Amino acid sequence: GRYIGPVCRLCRREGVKLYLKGERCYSPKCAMERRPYPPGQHGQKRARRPSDYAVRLREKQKLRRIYGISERQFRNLFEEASKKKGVTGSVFLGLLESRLDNVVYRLGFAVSRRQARQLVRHGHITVNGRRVDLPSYRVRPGDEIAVAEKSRNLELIRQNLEAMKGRKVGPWLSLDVEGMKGKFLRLPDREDLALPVNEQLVIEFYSR
Amino acid sequence: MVKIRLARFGSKHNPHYRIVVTDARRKRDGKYIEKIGYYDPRKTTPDWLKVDVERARYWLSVGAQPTDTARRLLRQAGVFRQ
Amino acid sequence: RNLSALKRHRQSLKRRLRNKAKKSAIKTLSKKAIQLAQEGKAEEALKIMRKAESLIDKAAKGSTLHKNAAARRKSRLMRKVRQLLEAAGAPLIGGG
Amino acid sequence: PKKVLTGVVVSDKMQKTVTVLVERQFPHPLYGKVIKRSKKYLAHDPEEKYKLGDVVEIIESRPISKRKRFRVLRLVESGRMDLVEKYLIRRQNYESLSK
Amino acid sequence: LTDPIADMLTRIRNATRVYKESTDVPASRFKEEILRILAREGFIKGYERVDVDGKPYLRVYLKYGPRRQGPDPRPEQVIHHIRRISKPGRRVYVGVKEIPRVRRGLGIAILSTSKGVLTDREARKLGVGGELICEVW
Amino acid sequence: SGDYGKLRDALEKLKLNDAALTFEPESSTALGFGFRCGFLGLLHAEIVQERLEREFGLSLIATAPSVVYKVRLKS
Amino acid sequence: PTINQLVRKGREKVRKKSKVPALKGAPFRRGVCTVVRTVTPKKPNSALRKVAKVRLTSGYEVTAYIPGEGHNLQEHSVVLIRGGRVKDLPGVRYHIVRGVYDAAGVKDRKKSRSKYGTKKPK
RNA sequence: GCUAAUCCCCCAUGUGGACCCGCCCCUUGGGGUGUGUCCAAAGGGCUUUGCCCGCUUCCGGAUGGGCCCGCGUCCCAUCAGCUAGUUGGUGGGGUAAUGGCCCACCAAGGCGACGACGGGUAGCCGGUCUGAGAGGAUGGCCGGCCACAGGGGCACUGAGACACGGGCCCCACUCCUACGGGAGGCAGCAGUUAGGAAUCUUCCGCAAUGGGCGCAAGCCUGACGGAGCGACGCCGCUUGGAGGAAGAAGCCCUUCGGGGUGUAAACUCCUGAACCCGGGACGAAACCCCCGACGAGGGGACUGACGGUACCGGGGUAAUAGCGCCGGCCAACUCCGUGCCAGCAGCCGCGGUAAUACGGAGGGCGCGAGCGUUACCCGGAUUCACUGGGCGUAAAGGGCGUGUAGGCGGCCUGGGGCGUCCCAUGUGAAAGACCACGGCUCAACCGUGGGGGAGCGUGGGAUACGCUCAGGCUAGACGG
RNA sequence: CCGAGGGUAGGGCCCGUGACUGGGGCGAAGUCGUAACAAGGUAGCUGUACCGGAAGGUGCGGCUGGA
Ligand code: SF4
Ligand SMILES: [Mg+2]
Ligand SMILES: [Mg+2]
Ligand SMILES: [Mg+2]
Ligand SMILES: [Mg+2]
Ligand SMILES: [Mg+2]
Ligand SMILES: [Mg+2]
Ligand SMILES: [Mg+2]
Ligand SMILES: [Mg+2]
Ligand SMILES: [Mg+2]
Ligand SMILES: [Mg+2]
Ligand SMILES: [Mg+2]
Ligand SMILES: [Mg+2]
Ligand SMILES: [Mg+2]
Ligand SMILES: [Mg+2]
Ligand SMILES: [Mg+2]
Ligand SMILES: [Mg+2]
Ligand SMILES: [Mg+2]
Ligand SMILES: [Mg+2]
Ligand SMILES: [Mg+2]
Ligand SMILES: [Mg+2]
Ligand SMILES: [Mg+2]
Ligand SMILES: [Mg+2]
Ligand SMILES: [Mg+2]
Ligand SMILES: [Mg+2]
Ligand SMILES: [Mg+2]
Ligand SMILES: [Mg+2]
Ligand SMILES: [Mg+2]
Ligand SMILES: [Mg+2]
Ligand SMILES: [Mg+2]
Ligand SMILES: [Mg+2]
Ligand SMILES: [Mg+2]
Ligand SMILES: [Mg+2]
Ligand SMILES: [Mg+2]
Ligand SMILES: [Mg+2]
Ligand SMILES: [Mg+2]
Ligand SMILES: [Mg+2]
Ligand SMILES: [Mg+2]
Ligand SMILES: [Mg+2]
Ligand SMILES: [Mg+2]
Ligand SMILES: [Mg+2]
Ligand SMILES: [Mg+2]
Ligand SMILES: [Mg+2]
Ligand SMILES: [Mg+2]
Ligand SMILES: [Mg+2]
Ligand SMILES: [Mg+2]
Ligand SMILES: [Mg+2]
Ligand SMILES: [Mg+2]
Ligand SMILES: [Mg+2]
Ligand SMILES: [Mg+2]
Ligand SMILES: [Mg+2]
Ligand SMILES: [Mg+2]
Ligand SMILES: [Mg+2]
Ligand SMILES: [Mg+2]
Ligand SMILES: [Mg+2]
Ligand SMILES: [Mg+2]
Ligand SMILES: [Mg+2]
Ligand SMILES: [Mg+2]
Ligand SMILES: [Mg+2]
Ligand SMILES: [Mg+2]
Ligand SMILES: [Mg+2]
Ligand SMILES: [Mg+2]
Ligand SMILES: [Mg+2]
Ligand SMILES: [Mg+2]
Ligand SMILES: [Mg+2]
Ligand SMILES: [Mg+2]
Ligand SMILES: [Mg+2]
Ligand SMILES: [Mg+2]
Ligand SMILES: [Mg+2]
Ligand SMILES: [Mg+2]
Ligand SMILES: [Mg+2]
Ligand SMILES: [Mg+2]
Ligand SMILES: [Mg+2]
Ligand SMILES: [Mg+2]
Ligand SMILES: [Mg+2]
Ligand SMILES: [Mg+2]
Ligand SMILES: [Mg+2]
Ligand SMILES: [Mg+2]
Ligand SMILES: [Mg+2]
DSSP states (O other): OOOOSOSHHHHHHTTSOOOOSSTGGGSTTSHHHHOOSOSSTTTTSOOOOOOHHHHHHHHHHHHHHHHTOOHHHHHHHHHHHHHSSSOHHHHHHHHHHTBHHHHHHHHTSSSSHHHHHHHHHTTOEEETTEEOOOTTOBOOTTEEEEEOGGGTTOHHHHHHHHTTSSOOOOTTEEEETTTTEEEEOSOOOTTTSOOSOOHHHHHHHHTO | OEEEEEEEEEETTEEEEEEEEEETTSOTTSOOSEEEEEEOTTOOSSOOEEEOHHHHHHHHHHTOEEOSHHHHHHHTTTSSOO | OOOSHHHHHHHHHHHHHHHHHHHHHHHHHHHHHHHHHHHOOHHHHHHHHHHHHHHHHHHTTSSSSOHHHHHHHHHHHHHHHHHHHHTTOOOOSSOO | OOOEEEEEEEEEEETTEEEEEEEEEEEOTTTOOEEEEEEEEEEEOTTOOOOTTOEEEEEEEEEEETTEEEEEEEEEEOOOHHHHHHHHHHHHHGGGSOO | OOOHHHHHHHHHHHHHTTTOSEEEEEOOHHHHHHHHHHHHTTSSSEEEEEEETTEEEEEEEOOBOOOOOSSSOOOOBSOOOEEEOSOSSSOOEEOGGGOOOGGGGTSEEEEEETTEEEEHHHHHHTTOOEEEEEEEO | OOTHHHHHHHHHHHHTTOSSOBOOEEOOTTTOSEEOOBOSSHHHHHHHHHHHHHHSOOOOOOOOOOOOOOOOOOO | OOHHHHHHHOOOOOOOOOSOGGGTTOSEEEEEEEEEEEEOOOTTOOOOEEEEEEEETTSOEEEEEOOSSOOOOOTTOEEEEEEOOOTTSTTEEEEEOTTSTTOOOOTTOOSSTTTTTOOOOO
């Protein structure tokens, strides 16, 4: 299945925080605040003018690791954006951003995307009342994503939810703290996510 | 003779029949003369049984013999309703 | 090792004899009629033609002859006979 | 509809039969150019009233023999022996195409 | 002369490229219909019917852009491109749904239709197709 | 040769009822692809070859047997 | 050519030739080694390249390459060949597959073991 | 020898129907009519001066078929000539029916460079794969058609067969006799064996859908519904999550200062695949019975192979990772070993004692229940070029004329309206592709709806260009 | 009568194989000479003819891709 393994090494290679952990990420304990050069024996040697293939490859790998997705699933979502009408880079981000495990993390039920994945997978999340443990679920406009209340009094969710008391959610979402519930309003515009990714490079990757 | 019967479509453990007028001698999923309605026996959707009442009586009037399950579904659509 | 396909075989044999016997008479009486017509002899020709017409149409109640098989037999027989008579004429009793 | 074609009698030689050479035009499926194709039909002439050079119409019909299933419909033009001459030359050119 | 129309297109092409004021093409009423469109769209100034040693010709009046700056001051052409589509070797016919769009509408296609000689845009407007004569841009 | 096919087959097709027979391939400049066979006694060897010949129509030759000598040179 | 010429004569489809006819035309073929020896390569390489002549089930007899360091094949070894020439050995159009029939895996191999036919070591 | 019937035959009745002849309409044998001849039938249950199922003849319908025709359907021209039932005619035979399908007789015809005949290969289509399209490749599963049932012939019975699990004969093979003769046909489902790189259970159930027979109860149904096995393909899911040192050990590198593996581990917290307990399906309401009338309508009961499965609730454990690669193409580099050896290799090429290219190691890159390899198809290959190529010297102008078929053809008018363009209409099955929505917690998969076109048929229209016909012109061509 | 097929005799095409034979491709460091590339030491090439271990030589005419 999904990757599982050291993730700092991942953010180090891509040369930017991928925020793959939530709490330590915004700390000075992060290897990126700490040692921001790619892993292994050669991270500290001088770079070499990247080939243009590598620049697109590293840009695609960047966007994908952010969301913790397989290349199989990343490739299918990109194919749908392409075959779909409308600007492919944006519909791609939308299609990625419409993911269940992602909307859970983005809402605040979980501190990191890997945790939201486990939150969805362990039964702790409901789409419109019904329990939905599939992490790749396509959340749709006007869907109510909530915490299954037979685990509403759960020490992780309470903590992380209280941490949202105050914090804002994206302009495309809503969140009833202590309702423990949220709405997907519309699918996000490209401007809404401030992603460290030139997604058109991803398009150029897959058109080789 | 000619028949009004169910042709199974759908997938495994997901039967979706078309109610269908065809020659008796074809295999049940083969070429049929006309599709006069459908039928989802698990009622997974609001309208799990459509029948074009006019055509059903036309083939009825012309000699096409409904089975039994098709007769019940046609009846349940008031096709025989005098 | 069995069937009721043996039955169908046995029954088929019975019917084979029945069809054979009927089609034989039909061929024998038609010929006799056409031979009488060729000599004319028209009184006996039309009589045999009528017993041939009879048999032909009795063969086509069942399986020995198709309707259109009897009609073609009857057509050609009534044309051989009549035309042979017409070459010296006089059609006596029943038939035309 | 029974098919109706127009062509020229190219052969008389047969009792109650005329060979009607029939031509058609169409764009090549791949190269688009307009090309001509042609096909000889043996046509039923129950009164041997049709003869060499007769541009005629033939109509699809119940089979009359082997390979004979058009009847001549009506005459359309007479004495077009140029059409016939084209055919025959083509045939005679075949004498030189051997080994 | 195997293709008069082609010959006019090449008579105009060869003359514009040397910046002739005019060029004569032997007369035919079909060519006038084509010239008429080139006039009506401003690819040529116009034409008149002349006598050249007692024979009928069509004097085409050619048009250029302004004299240019720099090395090589030769003006831009108005007729950049004029080329035969349909030809005696391969006639080319299109239905109304297959009328091409020459240079995203910055060019034209001229066609012969049983409703007259038209451009791509009148063809589509009168709902007819026909023989694709040339493209010009 | 290349009755070899009918020989390797005869051997296999008979082993599956002979607990004692053992065979395995070996080559020979003459006469080619054969089999080095273990038997449980001379009379057992006589009976196998009689089966091959009389029930499989095989004409063959019993030889040898020879052993894989290992060699150590200077290396 | 002219359109007319193309109508008269068409274009010819170009038809690919098999580099691997003895397979006929499967992905692999079984066979019995008849000769097992070394062979030398052509310029600019010098080696004692390990090789088998193989009599195939397809009726063909071909020389196949024995990849990897060391091998256990002798005359009368049953073997499986895949497509693939060895460029230094004109005539050698096929590779024996290590770890199938009587061909052992490469001993002590730790890298690329799925080629060379070597199980993951404990 | 006995004997019954819905078995067979004969007589009768003739609504009708068939056949000969005449006449009318109609136009290939379509329809009407007259006379003559000829042709029918069967009984069974019951609650019984009525119902149910049968039955005979006829017309029409519906469905399904046969036959015919236009057009499209691979390679070789180093296959160029082919044809005597051959091509047509007359009359017959045969069939449901046309036909040289068969036959007799007569004529001398038929076909072919627009590729006959011969060879080779091949079931064909909806589709499938690739492709920007055009095109190319393909025809497994599903749907439609065709063909075949050990090899070959044959007919019988029948609405229908020249019949996979019917018959007859011959052959090959295998197997049984008591020695006369006899048995068999898995290209049905399982399954065996052989061949092979390689392809599954001698499973369950007729609960559903569909078929046959029966008034019905019901019976049979290896169709089918399921379950099994195989990562074969696609989709979904897990092997954890958060915290956690300027940072353990081990290992690798090192200018021995240091760097790396690495927040990775440990360890803290908490979540809870597996598993356990309880429940537990949808798919199944008809047939049937009852009221009504056996109808419409009403009411009612029966029935689950899958399966105690899915799924729900409760409890509950930190719980498989691999494979390919790291000279360039191409993403990823160092140490050691080896020393044109052993080995790598898709191409370029690498190895000759300091190898980012061999082998191992550490690190790294890629993908992840997969990853690689071999085979093959389309692409990249405008490298067969219709879209979309070339030929002075790169491959490529015929040695030069003359000319046959063919291709192509200046300027003007009319007729036609074949090509071409337009509009309407029919056909273009279903599945699939596409769009939309909807159902399985998602997706795969499935459902409903929708738009399809080209092509071809019909009808109507147009006439510029190409064509045809008729007629002109003088500029091309030829003549004096 | 026709008729599966069996048989008899004679053709045609294709595949496999064959003593021996022809030339061809290829193969790290064999032998002979040196024909061509620089008037390559006789300008080259060329169609044909004849001759010679081999490249090649020569004749006849041609080409310049030699002056
Ligand atoms: S910690 Fe810093 S590095 Fe490690 S994951 Fe969060 S961001 Fe990426
Ligand atoms: Mg692509
Ligand atoms: Mg007799
Ligand atoms: Mg005839
Ligand atoms: Mg070397
Ligand atoms: Mg080398
Ligand atoms: Mg390995
Ligand atoms: Mg009685
Ligand atoms: Mg009677
Ligand atoms: Mg004859
Ligand atoms: Mg004669
Ligand atoms: Mg033709
Ligand atoms: Mg075949
Ligand atoms: Mg392309
Ligand atoms: Mg296939
Ligand atoms: Mg099929
Ligand atoms: Mg068999
Ligand atoms: Mg048989
Ligand atoms: Mg048989
Ligand atoms: Mg047979
Ligand atoms: Mg019969
Ligand atoms: Mg019957
Ligand atoms: Mg049979
Ligand atoms: Mg049968
Ligand atoms: Mg058959
Ligand atoms: Mg069987
Ligand atoms: Mg089987
Ligand atoms: Mg058996
Ligand atoms: Mg096997
Ligand atoms: Mg085997
Ligand atoms: Mg099996
Ligand atoms: Mg199966
Ligand atoms: Mg059933
Ligand atoms: Mg049933
Ligand atoms: Mg699976
Ligand atoms: Mg440190
Ligand atoms: Mg350390
Ligand atoms: Mg350490
Ligand atoms: Mg350290
Ligand atoms: Mg962790
Ligand atoms: Mg541990
Ligand atoms: Mg707990
Ligand atoms: Mg149920
Ligand atoms: Mg349970
Ligand atoms: Mg790789
Ligand atoms: Mg790559
Ligand atoms: Mg690189
Ligand atoms: Mg390697
Ligand atoms: Mg070294
Ligand atoms: Mg490499
Ligand atoms: Mg290495
Ligand atoms: Mg998966
Ligand atoms: Mg390719
Ligand atoms: Mg490309
Ligand atoms: Mg191409
Ligand atoms: Mg071209
Ligand atoms: Mg080129
Ligand atoms: Mg050259
Ligand atoms: Mg050249
Ligand atoms: Mg020349
Ligand atoms: Mg030349
Ligand atoms: Mg000339
Ligand atoms: Mg000419
Ligand atoms: Mg012409
Ligand atoms: Mg003209
Ligand atoms: Mg027209
Ligand atoms: Mg369709
Ligand atoms: Mg014979
Ligand atoms: Mg015999
Ligand atoms: Mg030979
Ligand atoms: Mg030889
Ligand atoms: Mg010299
Ligand atoms: Mg020299
Ligand atoms: Mg010299
Ligand atoms: Mg010299
Ligand atoms: Mg010379
Ligand atoms: Mg000399
Ligand atoms: Mg000279
Ligand atoms: Mg020179």
